[PDB]
Amino acid sequence: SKARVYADVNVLRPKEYWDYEALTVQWGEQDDYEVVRKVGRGKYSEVFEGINVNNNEKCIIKILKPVKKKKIKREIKILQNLCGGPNIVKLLDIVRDQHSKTPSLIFEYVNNTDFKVLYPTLTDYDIRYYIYELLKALDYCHSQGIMHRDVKPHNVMIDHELRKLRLIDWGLAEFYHPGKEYNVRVASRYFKGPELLVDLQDYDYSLDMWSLGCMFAGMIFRKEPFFYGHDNHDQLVKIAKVLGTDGLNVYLNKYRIELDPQLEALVGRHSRKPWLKFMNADNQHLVSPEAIDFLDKLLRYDHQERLTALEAMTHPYFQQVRAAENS
Ligand SMILES: O=c1c2c(O)cccc2oc2c([N+](=O)[O-])ccc(O)c12
């Protein structure tokens, strides 16, 4: 399997663009940034809000708790290559953290409003708008030969007041190379694509489109997460209970994949459950034929059948967003 788009991006670029291991950081000075308070944590990162001592503006300080250095260079190299892209967080500086020998990434400040409180208030139009903004970020990073691999509400910061969106945490992001087999223990459980769950390792940018689909489904149906599995095996079961096993079967057959016996039994057999079956009084104001058509084209077992970020952006669902933009 290989990406249907942007497959040769890293093939055409200098080895220095994607060879993150050869990266040598220009360590800045730690006293240049002052921590003001904690704001959260990734899987292996402590995040704080700070202030640049020199120019007094606000910044974000992400201390990469022991991640592994190979992994630290990867994230830095990717952030450097993506800086300036639409709706992508911007890396301003890189320093050493006193309490530890942990690198510490300084980002431009991003005001975010917790999605758990924000999402319930978004109107039909707001959802179209923000998803389109997120799509701009994905088509951009894909066009630059990079897969984010951890798309989820938690990594999409939105300033609802200024209507600004930023795709964050590129700690699991990677460079796409045709035919390469990647690790499947990426992304967060609820947003893991079928490829990660059946061990199809030569996956590509399309993985992000599945995760986007999961986020989108949770938003329009007001059910988060939309696929609520309790472990990776159960996650595939939850997906199969909605998309049906008929399609799962065609997929496994196409890619010559054999589900282990345990997982195959857990999956069982299920008929497809119509998207409209998920509509109720709480989400009626968000479920429209265009929303469902767009969603349907994202949540496909076959990663090769999913919309690309560029195609997604031209879907009629976003027609008003584009119209408004062309002015
Ligand atoms: O990983 C990040 C992150 C995280 O894991 C958990 C909670 C907040 C975060 O914020 C970030 C911000 N930010 O808030 O501007 C910028 C870049 C990042 O990588 C992160």
UniProtKB/Swiss-Prot annotation:
Binding positions (ATP): 39-47, 62
The protein, known as: Casein kinase II subunit alpha
GO molecular function ontology, one term from the record: protein serine/threonine kinase activity
Catalytic activity entry: L-seryl-[protein] + ATP = O-phospho-L-seryl-[protein] + ADP + H(+); L-threonyl-[protein] + ATP = O-phospho-L-threonyl-[protein] + ADP + H(+)
InterPro entries: CK2_alpha, Kinase-like_dom_sf, Prot_kinase_dom, Protein_kinase_ATP_BS, Ser/Thr_kinase_AS
GO biological process: DNA damage response; regulation of cell cycle
Pfam family, one: Pkinase
Cellular-component GO terms for this entry: cytosol; nucleus; protein kinase CK2 complex
Gene (UniProt): ACK2
SUBUNIT field: Tetramer of two alpha and two beta chains (possible).
